[PDB]
């Protein structure tokens, strides 16, 4: 994790990720209107202020 925090059911998620055989990602298609999606912190540094 990059931002300071922790998961819950950490070992359960880790075991299902080890048994995953890799990750295939589908774009969930969530389009957000009325608000902004640009939140970032200095803890994550890709080219400066970034986030996930």
């Amino acid at each position: 994790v990059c931002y300071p925090g922790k998961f819950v059911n950490e070992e359960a998620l880790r075991q299902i990720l080890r048994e995953s055989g890799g990750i295939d990602k589908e774009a969930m298609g969530f389009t957000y209107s009325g608000i902004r999606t640009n939140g970032a912190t200095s803890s994550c540094r890709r080219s400066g202020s970034s986030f996930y």
Partner: antibody
Amino acid sequence: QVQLQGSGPGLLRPSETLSLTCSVSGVSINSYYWSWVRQPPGKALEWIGYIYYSGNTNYNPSLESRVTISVDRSKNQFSLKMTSVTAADTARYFCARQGIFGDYGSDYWGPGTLVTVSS
Amino acid sequence: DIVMTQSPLSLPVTPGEPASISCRSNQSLQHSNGYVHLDWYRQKPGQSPHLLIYLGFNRASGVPDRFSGGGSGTDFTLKISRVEAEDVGVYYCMQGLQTPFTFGPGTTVDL
């Protein structure tokens, strides 16, 4: 915020295969699955069918066989083709996405590609 | 095929009054989550429509305060608090439960 844009032939004779195209920005047919509608001229509006961005298709039991929705993964425009066109199907095709499939952000309905079916 | 029953037909509204249009079908409309799939549309003639209310009871994005219409069960009603000059346009209500999708006959509201 995606931007939808449609294009295609207007003066078309009946019976032959119809062509249509529709360009989008932003989502790039990579995340959400778009659908299709059809506008009778000053009559009741109805729905054509949805196509998953992957390619799975579903339609209206009013009309199945004549409609073929293009997938077009690589190019950033998804298209529509109709066979056996009719002067009763002289319509104002709209190109869009809808609330209820999972996205709750309006429709971003594309412009009206007006078509006329006459000899 | 779920045939959609709009009511009423047309609203010759006066400027500045609370108006309302109902919407019902021959089914109970409820999703598995508990959130009803009902939409409210607004098509200016000669131009693409717009959504004003989504998910039944819920305020939509980019939509100001005069539209928050709800209801109960399978008959819902869009409420319009103030009538102004730009409220002309044909209105549609729409389910989202299952295929197929049947739009409404239309509500030609005018002054």
